[PDB]
Amino acid sequence: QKIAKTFTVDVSSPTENGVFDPASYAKYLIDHIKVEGAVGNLGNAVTVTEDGTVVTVVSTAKFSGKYLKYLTKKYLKKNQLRDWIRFVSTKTNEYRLAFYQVTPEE
Amino acid sequence: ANLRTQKRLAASVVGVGKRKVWLDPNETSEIAQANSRNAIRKLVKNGTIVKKAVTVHSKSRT
Amino acid sequence: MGRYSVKRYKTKRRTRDLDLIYNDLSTKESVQKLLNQPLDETKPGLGQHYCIHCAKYMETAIALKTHLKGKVHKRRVKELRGVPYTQEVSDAAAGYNLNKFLNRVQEITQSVGPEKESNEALLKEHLDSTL
Amino acid sequence: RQKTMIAEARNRKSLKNKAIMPRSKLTKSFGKMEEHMSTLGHDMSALQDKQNRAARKNRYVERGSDVVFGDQDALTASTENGVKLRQTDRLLDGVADGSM
Amino acid sequence: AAQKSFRIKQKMAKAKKQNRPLPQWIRLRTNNTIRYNAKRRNWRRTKMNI
Amino acid sequence: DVVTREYTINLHKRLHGVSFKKRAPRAVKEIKKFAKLHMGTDDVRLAPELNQAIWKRGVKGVEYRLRLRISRKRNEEEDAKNPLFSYVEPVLVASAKGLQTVVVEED
RNA sequence: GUGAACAGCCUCUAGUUGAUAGAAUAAUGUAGAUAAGGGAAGUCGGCAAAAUAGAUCCGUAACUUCGGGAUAAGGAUUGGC
RNA sequence: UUCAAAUGAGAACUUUGAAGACUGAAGUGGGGAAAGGUUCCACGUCAACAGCAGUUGGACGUGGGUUAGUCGAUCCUAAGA
Numbered sequence A: 001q002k003i004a005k006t007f008t009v010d011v012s013s014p015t016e017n018g019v020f021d022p023a024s025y026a027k028y029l030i031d032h033i034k035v036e037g038a039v040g041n042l043g044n045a046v047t048v049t050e051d052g053t054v055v056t057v058v059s060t061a062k063f064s065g066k067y068l069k070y071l072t073k074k075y076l077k078k079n080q081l082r083d084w085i086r087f088v089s090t091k092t093n094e095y096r097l098a099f100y101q102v103t104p105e106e
Numbered sequence B: 001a002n003l004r005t006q007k008r009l010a011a012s013v014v015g016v017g018k019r020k021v022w023l024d025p026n027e028t029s030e031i032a033q034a035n036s037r038n039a040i041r042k043l044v045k046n047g048t049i050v051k052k053a054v055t056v057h058s059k060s061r062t
Numbered sequence C: 001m002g003r004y005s006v007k008r009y010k011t012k013r014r015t016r017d018l019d020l021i022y023n024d025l026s027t028k029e030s031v032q033k034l035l036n037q038p039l040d041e042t043k044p045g046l047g048q049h050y051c052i053h054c055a056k057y058m059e060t061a062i063a064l065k066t067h068l069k070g071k072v073h074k075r076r077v078k079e080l081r082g083v084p085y086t087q088e089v090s091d092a093a094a095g096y097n098l099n100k101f102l103n104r105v106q107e108i109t110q111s112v113g114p115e116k117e118s119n120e121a122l123l124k125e126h127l128d129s130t131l
Numbered sequence D: 001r002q003k004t005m006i007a008e009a010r011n012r013k014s015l016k017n018k019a020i021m022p023r024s025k026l027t028k029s030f031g032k033m034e035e036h037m038s039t040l041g042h043d044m045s046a047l048q049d050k051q052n053r054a055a056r057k058n059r060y061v062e063r064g065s066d067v068v069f070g071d072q073d074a075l076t077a078s079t080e081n082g083v084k085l086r087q088t089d090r091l092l093d094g095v096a097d098g099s100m
Numbered sequence E: 001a002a003q004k005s006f007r008i009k010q011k012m013a014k015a016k017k018q019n020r021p022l023p024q025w026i027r028l029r030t031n032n033t034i035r036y037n038a039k040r041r042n043w044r045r046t047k048m049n050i
Numbered sequence F: 001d002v003v004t005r006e007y008t009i010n011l012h013k014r015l016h017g018v019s020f021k022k023r024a025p026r027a028v029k030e031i032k033k034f035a036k037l038h039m040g041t042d043d044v045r046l047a048p049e050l051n052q053a054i055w056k057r058g059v060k061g062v063e064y065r066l067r068l069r070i071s072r073k074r075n076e077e078e079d080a081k082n083p084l085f086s087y088v089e090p091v092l093v094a095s096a097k098g099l100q101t102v103v104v105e106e107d
Numbered sequence G: 001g002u003g004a005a006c007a008g009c010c011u012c013u014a015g016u017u018g019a020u021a022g023a024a025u026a027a028u029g030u031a032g033a034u035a036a037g038g039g040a041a042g043u044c045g046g047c048a049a050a051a052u053a054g055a056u057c058c059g060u061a062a063c064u065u066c067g068g069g070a071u072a073a074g075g076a077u078u079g080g081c
Numbered sequence H: 001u002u003c004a005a006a007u008g009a010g011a012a013c014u015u016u017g018a019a020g021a022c023u024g025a026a027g028u029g030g031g032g033a034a035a036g037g038u039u040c041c042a043c044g045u046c047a048a049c050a051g052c053a054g055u056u057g058g059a060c061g062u063g064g065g066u067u068a069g070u071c072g073a074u075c076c077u078a079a080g081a
């Protein structure tokens, strides 16, 4: 029916490397998650919170990990981090932001 | 160098056609050393040889 | 230039102009003379079944009914709805004989307009009754 | 800037004939990463520290093979027909000496 | 043909073993007049005719 | 001498009347001749990104105007028949219209 | 995918990118086109081209072995929302 | 068809990458029958041949490779011999 589902995103690596803003990311999710085809319709259905290293989304209305990845990739493209940071799944509905492979300059 | 054999072996090992196989142009000597499918598999694992994605045939307009 | 335009709008393959058709539709006497014609072999359908708007002869009453129940006739009627666009319009657009064009505009708006509309309505109801 | 981004994307993309290579399978360089992050306007201290740690970990120490065989080659006469050690040479096995 | 007879395969084996240039030590022999293999056969030049 | 400049090449008047199968190859050759004229170097090398910019709209869809960056540099190899060569790169701009030749400070 | 369709056209998987090249753009050719007004006056001869063409609706003669002729002929329409 | 790099004394024609195209499932794809007979593959390699070229090759030199109670022959009979 409307069993609540929890999705977690670990932003620790980009945040500690100082290229990411978890508060801006969570605000972007709050402003851009759609319910019944419209933004701004999260009344007691979708809740997004962040504690500096983990962003949690609790949803009872048609939210998938594919949708979360789509929105996160949109945010990274908007911040011009899409070429360097990717969104991956560690376990089911637990995700993280990682960097792409970079060889040292020396 | 002549990497025709390595291109064919990489296609056969990965399971795609030769059109979907990418050999790193900078690791030419490393690729040239690979005479066997086992070495080809090692190159695929370390990323010298990469499988490309399919070309899209979208059905949005259909 | 191209073959379609040349072989359609050649000089010898010309059709009746919009202002001439407007003058034919303006008065009831012209409508009567166009509807009631002597039987003439040189015209299709012995000169009967003639659409005034399209300025075209059809072979039969059913053919005329099908033509009237179609978009081509509707396009011609919508084209004829407006000002007939004489040379006075182009002269006024250049700024020439402006008072003459304004007089023609007010005459079209007052006298020739509603009478032509009433003639069109009467022609349409006559065609509907007789077809 | 938006028009320039459109032009750069058009020059980069060739989607009608083939797909774009995956970034998860490609690798890039820290110089390009640093210049892009500097253009974005972040702080490069943590990234530079990580790169310095990786570079100082990636050490090369000369080994005995480097000492002895580093500047040499061969050590074995190259055969005329490109054969192995125990492979017969139909053409030349009856003529033992290279002058003949 | 892939499904061939043993007789055909035997003649093919003999042709394969005959297909070679001269040994080089033949040229060094005293009063040698054999200077090349005058009966060399190639698959695309002269057919074996079964 | 080592120098870098940005130019606009008018490919429209140079490809005017060219057979459609030859338009992009002739554009490549026109860029090579343009660089030879402007830098005095018979050795002209085009960046593959510039080749992509030339060929982006097929064999007969070359742009009217292209913004090029041309760098005359030194031929570092000791077997070089000429001491200098030109390297031509694309300049992906918002529009190639209304741009004058400028000198880039090499830093 | 379009479309009645294993048709033509475009694409995915897979496979090619082979066939001496470069530079110019005279005549004459080979292959392909357009053309004012006239409309077979051309020519042994309408040769060759052009015109027609899918689908829906109206309508269809002589003759006939009654089965056909027949898509006879002659007309009207077609998009998008 | 084009660009760069590599290889090489030498690169329009070899290799890899970067592009643009094409075959368009009645294929320029994947397998077979007849026929051919090692052309398959690797290493070496350019005198001759590949109507230009050549560092490439179905070329030249040296080798490697085809594993069956169940797939076939083998057994049966057909027209016939």
Ligand SMILES: [Mg+2]
Pocket (backbone or CB within 6 Å): F017
């Ligand atoms: Mg021309």
Ligand SMILES: [Mg+2]
Pocket (backbone or CB within 6 Å): G035
């Ligand atoms: Mg004419």
Ligand SMILES: [Mg+2]
Pocket (backbone or CB within 6 Å): none
């Ligand atoms: Mg005559």
Ligand SMILES: [Mg+2]
Pocket (backbone or CB within 6 Å): none
């Ligand atoms: Mg005459």
Ligand SMILES: [Mg+2]
Pocket (backbone or CB within 6 Å): G072
């Ligand atoms: Mg008839």
Ligand SMILES: [Mg+2]
Pocket (backbone or CB within 6 Å): H024
């Ligand atoms: Mg096609």
Ligand SMILES: [Mg+2]
Pocket (backbone or CB within 6 Å): none
């Ligand atoms: Mg086979």
Ligand SMILES: [Mg+2]
Pocket (backbone or CB within 6 Å): none
């Ligand atoms: Mg072979």
Ligand SMILES: [Mg+2]
Pocket (backbone or CB within 6 Å): none
């Ligand atoms: Mg030759």
Ligand SMILES: [Mg+2]
Pocket (backbone or CB within 6 Å): none
């Ligand atoms: Mg051989």
Ligand SMILES: [Zn+2]
Pocket (backbone or CB within 6 Å): C051, C052, C053, C054, C055, C067, C068, C072, C073, C076
């Ligand atoms: Zn009408």
